[PDB]
């Protein structure tokens, strides 16, 4: 079990091609595991600079690539942007990416649309919401402990209530 992560900009050609190579490897290889990350390009600079500072790496171009030593979100060992990962895969596995530049343009659009999907999904989750709003004054009081379980019983309202409580 090997574990890798790659981070992307939604427009980045080489990140998309990396995604293709990654999925190829994970499909064909039993050994291979990878997790996937991408940021909006505006966020990307800050997000990556934070990551690089935490690691004390020194990489800036999208994509960025590293092997995580035990588990998802461990410490990482850094692989370089796309050419370095392709080099690693070709030499260690023998594998080759076959995707065209034109394809990379198209998928750069596809991943832009994917990020737009992600954004809309965030917005979509806001739509789903219909809680009941509750507040309690002087809540820091011994009665409050006994009360809360009765509220949580739901019998107060019927077991069909999205409850939001305040103290």
């Amino acid at each position: 079990m090997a574990k890798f992560v790659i981070a992307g900009k939604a427009n980045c050609p080489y990140y998309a091609k990396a995604e293709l190579l990654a999925d190829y490897l994970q499909k064909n290889l039993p050994d291979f595991r990878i997790f996937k990350i991408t940021q909006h390009p505006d966020k990307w600079e800050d997000w990556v600079e934070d990551v690089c500072e935490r690691n004390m790496w020194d990489h800036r171009t999208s994509p960025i690539i590293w092997r995580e030593l035990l588990d998802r979100g461990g410490r990482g060992l850094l692989l370089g942007g796309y050419n370095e990962f392709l080099e690693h895969a070709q030499l260690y596995y023998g594998v080759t990416s076959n995707m065209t530049t034109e394809l990379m343009m198209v998928i750069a659009k596809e991943n832009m649309q994917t990020h737009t999907e992600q954004q809309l999904d965030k917005e979509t989750m806001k739509d789903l919401i219909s809680p009941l709003q509750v507040w309690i004054a002087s809540a820091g009081t011994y009665v409050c402990c006994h009360l809360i379980p009765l509220l949580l019983s739901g019998e107060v309202f019927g077991m069909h209530t999205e409850i939001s409580l305040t103290l």
């Binding site: 050419n83 392709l86 080099e87 690693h88 030499l91 530049t101």
Partner: protein
């Protein structure tokens, strides 16, 4: 000129974790670029590591460390490959 006759010289390098050897793959991208521009190119294994040189008229002006290049493809997005194309054009 267009459809130049050219030699490429390339130096052996350690891929990450790996032995210092002559290797081609980024150079294969450069070769593809040069051929598409139209040219005939021959490849030479220089002893000096990692290094890339470009030759016509026996005259030579290029320097790169292979890892600086994009890997595979037409390399169109790699600025350095366009810089090579420019230098070739200027050689004329």
């Amino acid at each position: 000129p267009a459809q130049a006759v050219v030699t490429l010289r390339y130096g052996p390098y350690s891929a990450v974790g790996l032995s210092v050897e002559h290797r081609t793959y980024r150079l294969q991208g450069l070769q593809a670029v040069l051929a598409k521009d139209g040219h005939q190119i021959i490849l030479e294994q220089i002893e000096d590591w990692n290094l890339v040189e470009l030759v016509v008229n026996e005259e030579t002006v290029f320097q790169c460390d292979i890892q600086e290049l994009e890997f595979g493809g037409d390399g169109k997005l790699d600025p350095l490959c366009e810089e090579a194309r420019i230098a070739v054009l200027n050689a004329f």
